Enzyme design. Structure first.
Site, short mmCIF file in Angstrom:
data_model
loop_
_atom_site.label_atom_id
_atom_site.label_comp_id
_atom_site.label_asym_id
_atom_site.label_seq_id
_atom_site.Cartn_x
_atom_site.Cartn_y
_atom_site.Cartn_z
N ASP A 63 1.99 -8.77 6.51
CA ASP A 63 1.01 -8.03 5.84
C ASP A 63 -0.08 -8.88 5.45
O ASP A 63 -0.59 -8.41 4.20
CB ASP A 63 1.61 -6.92 5.02
CG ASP A 63 0.57 -5.72 4.53
OD1 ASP A 63 -0.08 -5.11 5.60
OD2 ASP A 63 0.48 -5.75 3.48
N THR A 64 -0.44 -10.00 5.85
CA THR A 64 -1.41 -10.68 5.19
C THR A 64 -2.68 -11.06 6.15
O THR A 64 -3.70 -10.17 6.25
CB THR A 64 -1.11 -12.17 4.62
OG1 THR A 64 -0.38 -12.77 5.50
CG2 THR A 64 0.13 -12.00 3.44
N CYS A 116 -1.09 -20.10 -2.39
CA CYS A 116 -0.23 -19.52 -1.23
C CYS A 116 0.23 -20.97 -0.38
O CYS A 116 -0.91 -21.82 0.12
CB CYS A 116 -1.25 -18.68 -0.39
SG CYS A 116 -0.53 -18.24 1.05
N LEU A 117 1.50 -20.89 0.19
CA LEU A 117 2.02 -21.80 0.85
C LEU A 117 1.74 -21.45 2.41
O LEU A 117 1.97 -22.48 3.16
CB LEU A 117 3.44 -21.88 0.68
CG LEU A 117 4.01 -22.55 -0.75
CD1 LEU A 117 5.37 -22.40 -0.77
CD2 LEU A 117 3.31 -23.87 -1.00
N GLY A 118 1.26 -20.35 2.62
CA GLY A 118 1.14 -19.98 4.15
C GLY A 118 -0.26 -20.04 4.35
O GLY A 118 -0.80 -19.71 5.43
N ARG A 155 0.80 -1.00 0.05
CA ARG A 155 -0.03 0.13 -0.03
C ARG A 155 0.86 1.18 0.03
O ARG A 155 1.06 1.93 1.03
CB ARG A 155 -0.91 0.00 1.17
CG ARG A 155 -2.01 -1.23 1.15
CD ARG A 155 -2.89 -1.17 2.46
NE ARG A 155 -1.93 -1.60 3.78
CZ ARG A 155 -1.64 -2.68 4.00
NH1 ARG A 155 -1.68 -3.77 3.13
NH2 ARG A 155 -0.84 -2.81 5.07
C1 HEM Z 1 -4.85 -14.63 4.93
C2 HEM Z 1 -3.33 -14.47 4.67
C3 HEM Z 1 -2.86 -14.80 3.27
C4 HEM Z 1 -3.45 -14.61 1.93
C5 HEM Z 1 -4.65 -14.10 1.48
C6 HEM Z 1 -2.36 -15.09 1.05
C7 HEM Z 1 -2.45 -14.89 -0.47
C8 HEM Z 1 -1.65 -15.55 -1.32
C9 HEM Z 1 -2.03 -15.35 -2.62
C10 HEM Z 1 -3.01 -14.85 -3.33
C11 HEM Z 1 -0.64 -15.97 -3.33
C12 HEM Z 1 -0.47 -16.19 -4.86
C13 HEM Z 1 -0.08 -14.70 -5.29
C14 HEM Z 1 0.17 -15.13 -6.89
O1 HEM Z 1 -0.27 -15.97 -7.64
O2 HEM Z 1 1.24 -14.21 -7.77
C15 HEM Z 1 0.15 -16.25 -2.23
C16 HEM Z 1 1.44 -16.98 -2.55
C17 HEM Z 1 2.40 -17.02 -1.25
N1 HEM Z 1 2.11 -16.87 -0.14
FE1 HEM Z 1 0.54 -16.15 0.87
N2 HEM Z 1 -1.41 -15.24 1.66
C18 HEM Z 1 -1.47 -15.15 2.98
C19 HEM Z 1 -0.58 -15.66 4.06
C20 HEM Z 1 0.50 -15.88 4.04
C21 HEM Z 1 1.25 -16.51 5.03
C22 HEM Z 1 1.26 -16.21 6.54
C23 HEM Z 1 2.69 -16.87 4.63
C24 HEM Z 1 3.90 -17.36 5.23
C25 HEM Z 1 4.58 -16.68 6.09
C26 HEM Z 1 2.40 -16.91 3.11
C27 HEM Z 1 3.46 -17.22 2.14
C28 HEM Z 1 3.17 -17.49 0.51
C29 HEM Z 1 4.32 -17.86 -0.22
C30 HEM Z 1 5.43 -18.47 0.10
C31 HEM Z 1 3.86 -17.69 -1.50
C32 HEM Z 1 4.04 -17.88 -2.69
C33 HEM Z 1 3.93 -19.50 -3.65
C34 HEM Z 1 4.74 -19.88 -4.70
O3 HEM Z 1 4.76 -18.81 -5.58
O4 HEM Z 1 4.73 -20.93 -5.04
N3 HEM Z 1 1.34 -16.34 2.76
N4 HEM Z 1 -0.49 -16.02 -0.89
#
Ligand code: HEM
EC number: 1.14.15.1
Length: 405
Positions: free
Chosen positions: A242-243, A348-350, A177
């Site tokens: 920030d998620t 998302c891995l998280g 943001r």
């Molecule tokens: C409610 C919370 C969250 C939402 C809505 C969210 C959403 C997303 C989305 C939409 C993507 C895909 C983006 C793309 O396709 O370019 C993504 C990827 C990812 N997220 Fe999250 N996320 C959240 C929390 C987290 C947390 C807590 C972690 C870990 C500390 C995390 C780690 C990752 C990683 C490592 C990827 C990359 C996966 C890849 O590129 O193979 N996320 N997330």
């Protein structure tokens, strides 16, 4: 500040939506984005805002584009173009099959096994933070819980000092943001300068923390580089800071206004997992995109190589074609359809860590503070960007109605 309409874009497909400052933001950020789903708006439109880019407005198209990495590349996944080009996090700036090995390594530090192992600390922290606030009869939810709960858990996982939170939180937020105070590149660089020294130390004297594991991991059968580890850890910091931090506030804001829904989960706790999913759909908050690898006709629309296309993960679940009465929260929906955690190869891995934190929060908060509401006359404001959020959430309650465990 609109950019000149490109020759290949028909005027009837123009709809000047600003993802960083939607016109109907006062009604709620999700409501602001939902204007793109009104009957006067085509399924795929071009906005002249933020440099000019396409916006897929329906779940069907959003899912299709996220699956077709061949035509829709993650090389430049952010809008504006300057941010997308500067963005080099791993694996989010890579397309399959290159992303494969890196995705596997990241899964090692935030995957389900890690979440199940950390569940006890997650529960412990939630209970402690909430019990402290309980007898106060009030709180500023964003800074009193939404931020400390997920962030401290992440800093514990990553083995990073909590004293660094303020510095890191400022930077991650500049990426999602923008304040105009610094370019996307500058914020990213600042984050890297913080990680570089730590990664070097962790590669020398490895630990069992997330950064050490990533820094000493193996990819493509060979040692991961200092640079690649840095690009991976940069993404983890954003995910940790920030998620969930933002999502919890949207959810708590809703619960404070819905006594019926609170009572529902209190007497029927087994519905919490489903409630978590429905809230993830209704208060979805992420919106990134892709870049066209070449000229391509997508659903009757001519897209040109280099064109950027925003595929709002937020919009799929709000599409009335995917969920009837989309703006209505119904924990008993037969099928909660959404793409809140993404779609395709980058799912998302998280997400497991996120769901655990959300479910623990719902159960532990409602147990101790079953009855609460938004402070009187308080006008809640939302903010929009790559990840949307809540500016402030003042809550109030009668301590006499609370319960210590
Ligand atoms: C409610 C919370 C969250 C939402 C809505 C969210 C959403 C997303 C989305 C939409 C993507 C895909 C983006 C793309 O396709 O370019 C993504 C990827 C990812 N997220 Fe999250 N996320 C959240 C929390 C987290 C947390 C807590 C972690 C870990 C500390 C995390 C780690 C990752 C990683 C490592 C990827 C990359 C996966 C890849 O590129 O193979 N996320 N997330």
């Amino acid at each position: 500040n609109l950019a000149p309409l490109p020759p290949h874009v028909p005027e009837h497909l123009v709809f000047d939506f600003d993802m960083y400052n939607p016109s109907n933001l006062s009604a709620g950020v999700q409501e602001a984005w939902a204007v793109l789903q009104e009957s006067n708006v085509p399924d795929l439109v071009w906005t002249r805002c933020n440099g000019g880019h396409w916006i897929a407005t329906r779940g069907q198209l959003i899912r299709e584009a996220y699956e077709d990495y061949r035509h829709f590349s993650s090389e430049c996944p952010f809008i504006p173009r300057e941010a997308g080009e500067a963005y080099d996090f791993i694996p989010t700036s890579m397309d399959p099959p290159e992303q494969r090995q890196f995705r596997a390594l990241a899964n090692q530090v935030v995957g389900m096994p890690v979440v199940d192992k950390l569940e006890n600390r997650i529960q412990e922290l939630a209970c402690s933070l909430i019990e402290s606030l309980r007898p106060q009869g009030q709180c500023n939810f964003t800074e009193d819980y939404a931020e400390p709960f997920p962030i401290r858990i992440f800093m514990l996982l990553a083995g990073l000092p909590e004293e660094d939170i303020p510095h890191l939180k400022y930077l991650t937020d500049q990426m999602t943001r923008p304040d105009g105070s610094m370019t996307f590149a500058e914020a990213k660089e600042a984050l890297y300068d913080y990680l570089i020294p730590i990664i070097e130390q962790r590669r020398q004297k490895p630990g069992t923390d997330a950064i050490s594991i990533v820094a000493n991991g193996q990819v493509n059968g060979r040692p991961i580089t200092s640079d690649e580890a840095k690009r991976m850890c940069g993404l983890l910091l954003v995910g940790g800071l920030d998620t969930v931090v933002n999502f919890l506030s949207f959810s708590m804001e809703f619960l404070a206004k819905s006594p019926e829904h609170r009572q529902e989960l209190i007497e029927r706790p087994e519905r919490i997992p489903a409630a978590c999913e429905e809230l993830l759909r209704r208060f979805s908050l992420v919106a990134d995109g892709r870049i066209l690898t070449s000229d391509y006709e997508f659903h009757g629309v001519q897209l040109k190589k280099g064109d950027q296309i925003l595929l709002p993960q937020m919009l799929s679940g709000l599409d009335e074609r995917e969920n009837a009465c989309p703006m209505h929260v119904d924990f008993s929906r037969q099928k909660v359809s959404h793409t809140t955690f993404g779609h395709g190869s980058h799912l998302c891995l998280g997400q497991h860590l996120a769901r655990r934190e959300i479910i623990v929060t719902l159960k532990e908060w409602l147990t101790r503070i079953p009855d609460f509401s938004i402070a009187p006359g308080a006008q809640i404001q939302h903010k929009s960007g790559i990840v949307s959020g809540v500016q402030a959430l003042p809550l109030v309650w009668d301590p006499a109605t609370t319960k210590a465990v």
